[PDB]
Ligand SMILES: Nc1ncnc2c1ncn2[C@@H]1O[C@H](COP(=O)(O)OP(=O)(O)NP(=O)(O)O)[C@@H](O)[C@H]1O
Ligand SMILES: Nc1ncnc2c1ncn2[C@@H]1O[C@H](COP(=O)(O)OP(=O)(O)NP(=O)(O)O)[C@@H](O)[C@H]1O
Ligand SMILES: [Mg+2]
């Protein structure tokens with residue numbers, strides 16, 4: 001059913017801040033229930049209407065939409081706490097983002113994971129697709145680790161909580177149609193999904209690293225995608241190229257995406273090649 | 284003409300040691316001429332007959348061969364100093380080897396140099412070819428920097444100063460043309476092989492060839508036609524010249540003359556043949572295309 005627990009500011013306490021972002025500031029904090037006994041570790045995201053024009057006193061149906069979703073591979077929303085500014089509350093994952101992870105560990109990661117995370121991310125995303133929830137900010141910074149083996153999609157729907165404002169970058173993940181016509185769809189997420197796997201296999205590389213943001217659309221419009229990561233067979237890189245296929249209706253469903261990476265995960269090294277040691281051995 | 288200055292141990296003084304190697308130990312030292320005034324910075328290499336069987340009291344014609352060579356892109360031999368152990372004397376180059384260089388600087392180096400050193404190394408080597416001097420140990424550790432722009436081939440001929448001992452090599456087979464590894468057959472074209480592995484060393488910004496492999500597998504895999512892989516900065520043109528160097532057929536491998544020509548014209552448009560990441564990770568691939 002479509003609901004969401006509401007919190008009282010007397011139950012939520014912020015301890016220290018984790019960081020800000022596109023639109024919002026995440027805090028580490030606890031939650032003391034009406035038992036008043038022990039404190040539960042939680043993560044409090046604070047959203048505001050920048051302009052100080054509208055407030056978050058009323059609960060919308062969209063907050064209920066976010067608030068009611070639950071899947072093994074998402075960071076479920078524990079509840080909201082309305083007020084002049086919105087406070088989203090979720091579980092606290094000390095393992096940080098998946099991006100910060102593939103940077104402080106690189107290829108040392110099992111080639112089995114670097115495919116098991118492609119599968120996991122795809123299921124959560126497929127789940128959201130099922131219940132008609134568009135993400136609008138899928139990325140490796142926006143994937144969190146729960147088990148050292150298990151990830152979870154996070155920070156979804158959060159964009160449709162605010163009035164447009166293409167002045168604030170997430171564009172390096174946006175399907176081109178979203179960049180031209182603010183047209184966000186499940187298939188625009190699929191695009192964003194491709195750039196995330198790139199992020200992954202690239203062991204945490206910033207896309208379009210030395211380019212200028214305004215050139216990002218043009219070059220892309222000209223048919224230039226991100227290059228192939230140095231660990232991917234042309235099979236693991238072909239799935240990404242589909243994600244960025246200009247035609248929305250052509251891009252794979254997360255269902256498809258989930259299938260490929262699941263069977264590709266049956267033979268990890270056959271599709272991923274992580275240097276045991278420069279290059280070597282090439283006829 | 285074919286000669287070489289002989290030194291007296293009273294003129295040569297060793298100050299501190301730089302390192303050992305395959306067969307020999309290089310020292311930093313000075314040379315006080317019979318003026319006895321000032322001391323000239325020099326580099327003294329010490330060679331011995333390991334087994335303590337033969338000595339280096341007599342000068343051979345080969346020492347004269349090494350001793351008489353002079354080209355802008357070699358480390359000329361200043362002279363020899365015979366004795367129970369041989370002492371080769373050359374200029375001292377504080378800029379160390381070219382290998383230790385492309386490691387402490389990587390791609391920051393001008394793509395213009397990484398081709399200007401391929402040219403320079405090729406000329407020196409061609410020079411040696413002219414005067415019939417085979418090197419037998421060409422490598423990036425064996426190339427030295429004189430100007431921050433100019434390199435010089437070093438440590439040549441030094442192998443033919445010793446009786447064959449193919450177990451003390453413990454490298455340098457990771458540079459040896461395969462025929463030299465099978466049949467101790469060292470030739471100008473075996474050097475060309477060694478030259479290829481050195482450019483690799485270069486563009487690879489100082490990577491140890493066959494990094495995680497086992498030495499005994501090096502010949503087999505190679506015999507099976509597997510060469511070193513392509514460095515991540517080389518167009519398929521700068522990597523094709525290397526593949527020729529390792530072409531099993533000696534008579535097919537490029538002369539250093541050829542090698543000198545390609546790299547000289549390739550040096551006319553540095554980025555057109557070398558691509559050094561201005562940033563981390565790949566980026567901007569040509570728009571690929573799936574199949575249904
Ligand atoms: N459940 C969590 N447990 C621990 N840390 C979290 C959790 N959720 C978010 N964070 C961290 O909160 C920090 C700041 O919030 P956020 O605005 O999401 O960062 P961000 O990198 O900008 N992602 P985004 O703004 O969505 O593009 C991040 O660096 C997160 O990894
Ligand atoms: N002319 C020179 N000026 C400064 N350093 C030098 C000079 N010649 C040799 N060296 C250094 O001397 C050290 C030890 O001598 P050497 O045995 O030649 O080293 P190596 O790395 O083993 N080369 P090789 O033995 O020929 O395979 C090296 O690390 C050199 O860089
Ligand atoms: Mg986030």
Ligand SMILES: [Mg+2]
Pocket residue numbers: 304424425437438
């Ligand atoms: Mg040397």
